[PDB]
């Protein structure tokens, strides 16, 4: 009624101011990035928490404090070979400048002759991926709880002219309170307007990215559509054995929903998985509000989510500091450091 209208109308003026102060803070750091804030020997390398097509993330304990952290290690030479120089510079420069409840915090960063290091706060709950695959699928309220956090995060990121570009269960972690911690800013980019790089993860690529067309922040909203679908169904809306097969499905414009999906969920998803980006939710005149006001999110207290006052639907087990039981095991490898500095000029600003 007239009460909700006032509540919604007022809250928007508030988030408006919030975002305003947030941009000031961000800009300050974006213009003058922190650099060389620690060194390799101040940490003891414990175990590999995960690997990607780019780096290795290892659990580590800070010697002069005992505190644990998640350290991402990138081989400078490999970065160059995979043509990820600018992306890597974007990754660190952006990650060190952002500040939001659901974004993993970058504690320190530095480099040596061979590698680039990004020391993050260790999120011990494990990837959303493992829990999702183990459980099968999340109930709509469970999926909604996480979705709401992604919506707020993208509102934040997008307001700073940042595009995320790699939303997936694998890049989302659960903290001790059962809340989300977005990691992997490898494809994050500060850009006003269209961009063209082919990047992301197959199952989550928007049609524009696949068709080598320029694209904008709307790809993140499409990715959200895929995330919610996968979280609620247990499998992706577009899957196959080869990426190209997945791509043909993505651009086709055809999506089928499980019989157990609610009417509200299907409607929201048809709007997010909208091939026509001019008709896609999050990219219309009212932007992100079209999503926040959508029926599927009717029971979502957005301000409460931001304050982390909502009881999480699931809280991972934590047997104390250094506990990596929520992560798969990986084959280890010595962290080699050449006596010769590699790709110095390329990574000067890191």
């Amino acid at each position: 009624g007239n009460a909700a209208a006032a509540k919604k109308g007022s809250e928007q003026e508030s988030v408006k101011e919030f975002l305003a102060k947030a941009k000031e803070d961000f800009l300050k750091k974006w213009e003058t990035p922190s650099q060389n804030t620690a060194q390799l020997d101040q940490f003891d390398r414990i175990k590999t928490l995960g690997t990607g097509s780019f780096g290795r993330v290892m659990l580590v304990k800070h010697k002069e404090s005992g505190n644990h952290y998640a350290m991402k290690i990138l081989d400078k030479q490999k970065v160059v070979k995979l043509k990820q120089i600018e992306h890597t510079l974007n990754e660190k420069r952006i990650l060190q400048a952002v500040n939001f409840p659901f974004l993993v915090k970058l504690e320190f960063s530095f480099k040596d002759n061979s590698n680039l290091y990004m020391v993050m706060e260790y999120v011990a709950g494990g990837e959303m991926f493992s829990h999702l695959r183990r459980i099968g699928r999340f109930s709509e309220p469970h999926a909604r709880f996480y979705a709401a956090q992604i919506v707020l995060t993208f509102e934040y990121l997008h307001s700073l002219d940042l595009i995320y570009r790699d939303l997936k269960p694998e890049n989302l972690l659960i903290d001790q309170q059962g809340y989300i911690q977005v990691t992997d800013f490898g494809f994050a980019k500060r850009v006003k307007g269209r961009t063209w790089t082919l990047c992301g993860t197959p199952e989550y690529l928007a049609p524009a990215i696949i068709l080598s067309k320029g694209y904008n922040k709307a790809v993140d909203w499409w990715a959200l559509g895929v995330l919610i679908y996968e979280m609620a169904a247990g499998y992706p809306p577009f899957f196959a054995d080869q990426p190209i097969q997945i791509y043909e499905k993505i651009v086709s414009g055809k999506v089928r929903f499980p019989s157990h999906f609610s009417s509200d969920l299907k409607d929201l998803l048809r709007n997010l998985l909208q091939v026509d980006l001019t008709k896609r939710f999050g990219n219309l005149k009212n932007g992100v509000n079209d999503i926040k006001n959508h029926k599927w999110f009717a029971t979502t207290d957005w301000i409460a989510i931001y304050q982390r006052k909502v009881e999480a639907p699931f809280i991972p087990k934590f047997k104390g500091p250094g506990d990596t039981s929520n992560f798969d095991d990986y084959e280890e490898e010595e962290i080699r450091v050449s006596i010769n500095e590699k790709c110095g000029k390329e990574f000067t600003e890191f």
């Binding site: 990607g52 780019f54 992301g200 993860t201 499998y235």
Partner: peptide
């Protein structure tokens, strides 16, 4: 079922990014 077809496919494990 769709879920059975997914579970039997080659991409049910952790997915790495492409570039």
């Amino acid at each position: 079922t769709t879920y059975a077809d997914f579970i039997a496919s080659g991409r049910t494990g952790r997915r790495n990014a492409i570039h």
